[PDB]
Amino acid sequence: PSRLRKTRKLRGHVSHGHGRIGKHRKHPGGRGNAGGMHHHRINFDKYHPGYFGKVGMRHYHLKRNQSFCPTVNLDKLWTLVSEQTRVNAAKNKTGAAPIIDVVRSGYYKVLGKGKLPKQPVIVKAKFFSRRAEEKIKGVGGACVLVA
């Protein structure tokens, strides 16, 4: 909406909001990211620190799907199965343990951050973390691996 913009109140003022002494010239600093090392060093150091230089090893033909591994935390682990599986395992008495298959939900690694409810589980996953496995033993449960 031009009728809402700022150039509708700027009709009649000579410099059009841009200065009488210092005009609105075209490129009074160079174009783009120019002068990153010479006259814009205070800004490229106060706001983009580490922007200049090399570090580390290159990797030519990187393919972003060999290193695919989406993780799910223990806090929302019990959210992968329905509710009538966690409460069915609550009401359960024969000690049966529901099998939570994670790679079926779309995660490979299981990280252990949250608390767990006191009931057994059988977590099928591709990769496990040490703490994610200890929080499962400490509640009683098995960490199955699936290639």
Partner 1 sequence: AALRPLVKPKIVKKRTKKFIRHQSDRYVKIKRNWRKPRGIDNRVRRRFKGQILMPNIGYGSNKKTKHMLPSGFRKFLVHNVKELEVLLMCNKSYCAEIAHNVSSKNRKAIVERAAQLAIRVTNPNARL
Partner 2 sequence: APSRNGMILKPHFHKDWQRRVATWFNQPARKIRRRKARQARARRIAPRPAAG
Partner 3 sequence: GVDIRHNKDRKVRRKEPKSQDIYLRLLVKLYRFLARRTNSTFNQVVLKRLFMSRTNRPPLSLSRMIRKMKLPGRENKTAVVVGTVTDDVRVQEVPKLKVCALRVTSRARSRILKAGGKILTFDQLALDSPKGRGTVLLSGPRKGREVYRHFGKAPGTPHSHTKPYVRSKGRKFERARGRRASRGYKN
Q: Which residues of the shown chain bind RNA in the complex (CB under 7 A)?
A: 1-3, 6, 8-22, 24
> Please, which residue, 12 or 32, has the CB nearer to partner 1?
12
The H helix count followed by the E strand count for the chain is 3, 6
Give me the 40-79 binding string for partner 3, x by CB under 8 A, dash otherwise. Answer: -----xxxxxxxxxxxx------------------xx-xx
Sheet holding 141-145, edge to edge: 99-101, 121-125, 141-145
Applying CB under 8 A, which of residues 1, 12, 22, 32 lies at the interface with partner 1?
12
Are 112 and 90 within 8 A, CB to CB? no
Determine which residue in the list 4, 14, 42, 55 makes contact with partner 1, applying CB under 8 A. Answer: 14
Decide which of Mg ion, partner 3, partner 1, none touches 17; Cβ closer than 5 to 8 Å per partner kind: Mg ion
Supply the DSSP symbol for 106: T
Strands 121-125 and 99-101: parallel
- As a whole number of angstroms, the distance between CA 112 and CA 77 comes to 9
**75 touches which of Mg ion, partner 3, RNA, none (CB within 5 to 8 A by kind)?**
partner 3
